[PDB]
Amino acid sequence: MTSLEKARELLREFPVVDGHNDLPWALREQVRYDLDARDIAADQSAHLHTDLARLRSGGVGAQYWSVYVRSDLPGAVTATLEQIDCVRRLIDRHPGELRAALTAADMEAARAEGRIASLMGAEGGHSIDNSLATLRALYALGVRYMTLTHNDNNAWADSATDEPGVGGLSAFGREVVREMNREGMLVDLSHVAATTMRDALDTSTAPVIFSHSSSRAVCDHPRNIPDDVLERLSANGGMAMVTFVPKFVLQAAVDWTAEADDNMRAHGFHHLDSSPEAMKVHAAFEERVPRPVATVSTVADHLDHMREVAGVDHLGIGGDYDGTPFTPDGLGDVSGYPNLIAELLDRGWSQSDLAKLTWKNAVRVLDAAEDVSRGLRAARGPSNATIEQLDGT
């Protein structure tokens, strides 16, 4: 059979655990959670990267659904609860296809019955409003990882896409990591500064993840992971879930985006300005310089290097579907994963290597978080500390 046919066979046995899909935010923005208007039991290819049929075609067996909210707007906690509610509603609406999962055992139970294990990950520490009790409430509601920042610093952690702030984690930031370890919530180091990555690895007594980050050695961008950090994953026991975002994984797209951003500033606009006037400027840039397009090969280049440095036991996949506008050719929506698996087969990845990448590493890591949590919950009570106490007024 072809490598694509073999890939589909392999995914039927050990499907993809995807680290980060922003369907909930997409539903919030497109239809304010009017789920009938974007029914994922129907074909949503006109509007979304994600629906149930395409997930099945793609060999997705578990999904961390992102409960991302904007850090630059007030009411992040309320919005996070709305995002969690959206995930709960999706699970309730589609019991034939989805099964809530809170544990590694739930993931295996879902796989045994042919349902997609549906987990939640918060995207940015702003979702806890500097409150450890709020962190504990998010865990109680089912959140199983939290990205420590999004694109901006928060009071206790530095983002890769902001200026230096506290220098990594503050004292309260370390306290957040400790409490995540005690609860069993995975520490997610996507988005954070390299300083923050190192501080989190120093502090964490559980395996950490990167829910959607690729390799900085392959493509120098702050959203990607440095080799020295990848090297620490074996010891930590965690995993880096490669992402598909072209402006992170393809050198030409990194360079193009930098030039587009410079061009915006040359016209007196902030690079994130989305006014009609700013859009005119950007359209003119794209007219003279077309947007480069990544491929499955681009993503495989990241995985090859990540495998060399981190090891095959420390890799996963986090596509970022419905969280980013552009995709590599062959990975245009959630049905695309078999194309990546086929490319890896062609590059000599073994069947067991691939079962680790798709399924086994993610289950091991969540189980490890549970194991560390058992020990810490038995050893001490929850923290009552405040940011004022640990970081000063």
With b for 16 or more beta-carbon neighbours within 10 A and e for fewer, the 201-219 pattern comes to bebbebbbbbbbbbbbbbb
Q: Mark whether 271 is an active-site residue.
A: no
Quick one: which H or E segment has residue 65? strand 60-66
In sequence order, the 6+-apart residues with CB closer than 8 A to the CB of 268 are none
Which residue stretch of 15-23, 32-40, 227-235, 238-246 sits at the interface with Zn ion (rule: CB under 5 A)?
Answer: 15-23
Query: If contact means CB under 5 to 8 A according to the sort of partner, which of Zn ion, ligand P4D, none does residue 111 touch?
Result: none
- For residue 209, give Cα distances in angstroms to 235, 296, 315: 13, 23, 9
Of residues 66 through 85, those in contact with Zn ion by CB under 5 A are 66, 68
Active site residue 22: yes
Catalytic residue chosen out of the listed positions 94, 126, 150, 302: 150
User: Is 212 marked as binding a ligand?
Assistant: yes
Q: For residue 34, say whether it is annotated as part of any ligand binding site.
A: no
Measured in Å, how far apart are the chain's first and last C-alpha atoms? 65
Q: Which does 29 bind (CB under 5 to 8 A by kind): ligand P4D, Zn ion, none?
A: ligand P4D
- Per-position x/- string for 118-147, each x denoting binding to Zn ion as judged by CB under 5 A, each - no binding: -----x------------------------
Residues in the chain: 393
The yes-or-no answer on residue 314 being catalytic is no
Between the CA atoms of 41, 91, 17 and 188, what dihedral angle is there, to the nearest 10 degrees? 130
Picked from ligand P4D, Zn ion, none, the partner binding residue 175 (CB below 5 to 8 A depending on kind) is none
Catalytic residue among 20, 94, 221, 282: 20
Q: Rule CB under 5 A: which of 193-252 touch Zn ion?
A: none
**Catalytic position from the list 51, 97, 123, 301:** 123
Q: Which residue is nearest to Zn ion (CB)?
A: 323
The reply to whether 82 sits in an annotated binding site is no
> Which residue is it, tokens 């050893």?
379
Interhelix angle 171-183/132-141, nearest 10 degrees: 30
- List of residues contacting ligand P4D (CB under 6 A): 22, 25, 29, 68, 123, 212, 223, 245, 320, 323-324
Q: Which of 94, 126, 191, 302 is flagged as catalytic?
A: 191
State the DSSP H helix or E strand holding residue 369, giving kind and residue range, or none if neither. Answer: helix 361-379
The yes-or-no answer on residue 152 being catalytic is no
CB 77 within 8 A of CB 134: yes
Residue 241 pairs in a beta bridge with 316
Question: Is 123 annotated in the active site?
Answer: yes
Of 121 and 330, nearer to ligand P4D (C-beta) is: 121
Instruction: Please state, in angstroms and as integers, the Cα–Cα distance from residue 23 to each residue in 35, 55, 260, following that order.
Output: 11, 12, 27
What are the residues whose beta carbons fall under 8 Å from the beta carbon of 259, sequence distance 6 or more?
Answer: 285, 289
Closer residue to ligand P4D (CB): 223 or 356: 223
Which of 22, 183, 188, 322 binds Zn ion (CB under 5 A)? It is: 22
Q: Between 115 and 212, whose beta carbon lies closer to ligand P4D?
A: 212
Q: Which of 18, 22, 51, 333 is catalytic?
A: 22
**Annotated binding residues for Zn(2+), as ranges?**
20, 22, 123, 191, 212, 320
Which residues are catalytic, by number? 20, 22, 123, 150, 191, 212, 320
Contacting positions for Zn ion (CB under 5 A): 22, 66, 68, 123, 323
